[PDB]
Amino acid sequence: XYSP
Amino acid sequence: XYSP
Amino acid sequence: XYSP
Amino acid sequence: XYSP
Amino acid sequence: XYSP
Amino acid sequence: XYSP
Amino acid sequence: XYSP
Amino acid sequence: XYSP
Amino acid sequence: XYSP
Amino acid sequence: XYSP
Amino acid sequence: XYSPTS
Amino acid sequence: XYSPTS
Amino acid sequence: XYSPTS
Amino acid sequence: XYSPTS
Amino acid sequence: XYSPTS
Amino acid sequence: XYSPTS
Amino acid sequence: XYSPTS
Amino acid sequence: XYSPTS
Amino acid sequence: XYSPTS
Amino acid sequence: XYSPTS
Amino acid sequence: XYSP
Amino acid sequence: XYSPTS
Amino acid sequence: XYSP
Amino acid sequence: XYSPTS
Amino acid sequence: XYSP
Amino acid sequence: XYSPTS
Amino acid sequence: XYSP
Amino acid sequence: XYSPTS
Amino acid sequence: XYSPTS
Amino acid sequence: XYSPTS
Amino acid sequence: XYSPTS
Amino acid sequence: XYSPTS
Amino acid sequence: XYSPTS
Amino acid sequence: XYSPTS
Amino acid sequence: XYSPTS
Amino acid sequence: XYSPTS
Amino acid sequence: XYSPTS
Amino acid sequence: XYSPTS
Amino acid sequence: XYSPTS
Amino acid sequence: XYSPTS
Amino acid sequence: XYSPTS
Amino acid sequence: XYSPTS
Amino acid sequence: XYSPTS
Amino acid sequence: XYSPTS
Amino acid sequence: XYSPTS
Amino acid sequence: XYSPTS
Amino acid sequence: XYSPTS
Amino acid sequence: XYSPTS
Amino acid sequence: XYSPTS
Amino acid sequence: XYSPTS
Amino acid sequence: XYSPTS
Amino acid sequence: XYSPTS
Amino acid sequence: XYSPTS
Amino acid sequence: XYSPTS
Amino acid sequence: XYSPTS
Amino acid sequence: XYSPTS
Amino acid sequence: XYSPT
Amino acid sequence: XYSPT
Amino acid sequence: XYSPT
Amino acid sequence: XYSPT
Amino acid sequence: XYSPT
Amino acid sequence: XYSPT
Amino acid sequence: XYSPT
Amino acid sequence: XYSPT
Amino acid sequence: XYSPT
Amino acid sequence: XYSPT
Amino acid sequence: XYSPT
Amino acid sequence: XYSPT
Amino acid sequence: XYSPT
Amino acid sequence: XYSPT
């Protein structure tokens, strides 16, 4: 997986 | 996977 | 995978 | 995969 | 794949 | 694939 | 493939 | 392929 | 292919 | 191919 | 291929 | 292939 | 392949 | 393949 | 494959 | 594969 | 695979 | 796989 | 896998 | 896997 | 995973 | 796995 | 995992 | 696993 | 895990 | 696991 | 774990 | 596990 | 596709 | 396609 | 696809 | 297609 | 895909 | 197509 | 995918 | 995926 | 994924 | 994932 | 994950 | 994770 | 994790 | 963790 | 962790 | 983790 | 994780 | 993860 | 992941 | 993932 | 993924 | 994916 | 994908 | 995809 | 795709 | 596609 | 497609 | 397509 | 962990 | 983990 | 993990 | 993982 | 993963 | 993955 | 993946 | 994937 | 994929 | 894919 | 794809 | 595809 | 495709 | 396609  |  |  |  |  |  |  |  |  |  | 010019 | 020019 | 020029 | 030029 | 040029 | 050029 | 070039 | 180049 | 290049 | 290059 |  | 390169 |  | 390189 |  | 390299 |  | 290299 | 039917 | 039927 | 049906 | 039938 | 149906 | 029939 | 249905 | 349904 | 449903 | 639902 | 739901 | 819910 | 909820 | 809640 | 349910 | 269900 | 269901 | 169903 | 069904 | 059905 | 059916 | 049917 | 039928 | 029938 | 019938 | 019949 | 019959 | 009969 | 029985 | 039985 | 039986 | 039996 | 039997 | 038998 | 037998 | 036998 | 036998 | 035999 | 034999 | 033999 | 033999 | 032999 998760790359905000 | 997930690339917001 | 998923590329918003 | 998925490219919104 | 899918290219909205 | 799919190109909406 | 598919090109709507 | 398919070209609607 | 198919060209509607 | 097919050209409707 | 088929190669139209629609 | 099919290669249109829509 | 299919390779349009939309 | 499909390789458009949208 | 699909490899567009959007 | 899918490999766009968005 | 998916490997974009966004 | 997914391997973007954002 | 996911392996970006942000 | 996830292995970014932020 | 999670990479804010 | 997660193994970044921040 | 979590990498603020 | 988590194994960063901060 | 947690890496502030 | 967690095993950083701070 | 926790690494402030 | 936690095993840093601070 | 292989043995599609209908 | 291979042996399509209908 | 392999034996798609409908 | 190969041996299409109908 | 393998034996998709509908 | 190869040996189409009907 | 394997035996997707609908 | 394996036997996805809907 | 394995038997995802919906 | 295993039997995810919704 | 195992039987995640929602 | 095991039976996560929400 | 085991039966996490929320 | 075991039955974490919130 | 060891956590049985015999 | 070890977590049986014998 | 090890998680049997014997 | 190891997760049998013997 | 390993996930048999013996 | 490994997922047999022996 | 590996997924046999021996 | 590898998916035999021996 | 590899998918034999030996 | 490779898909033999030996 | 490769699809023999040896 | 290649599709022999040796 | 290539489709021999050796 | 090529389709021999050697 | 050891699970004999 | 060890699961004998 | 080890799964003998 | 090991799955003997 | 290893699947002997 | 390894599938001996 | 490896499929010996 | 490898399919020996 | 490899299909020896 | 490779199909030796 | 390769079809040796 | 290649068809040696 | 190539058909040597 | 090529048909050597």
Coordinates of C-alpha atoms in Angstrom, one line a residue, chain i:
Chain i
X1 CA -8.8 -17.8 -13.5
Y2 CA -9.7 -21.4 -12.9
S3 CA -13.4 -22.3 -13.4
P4 CA -14.7 -18.7 -13.2
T5 CA -18.5 -18.7 -13.2
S6 CA -21.0 -15.9 -14.1

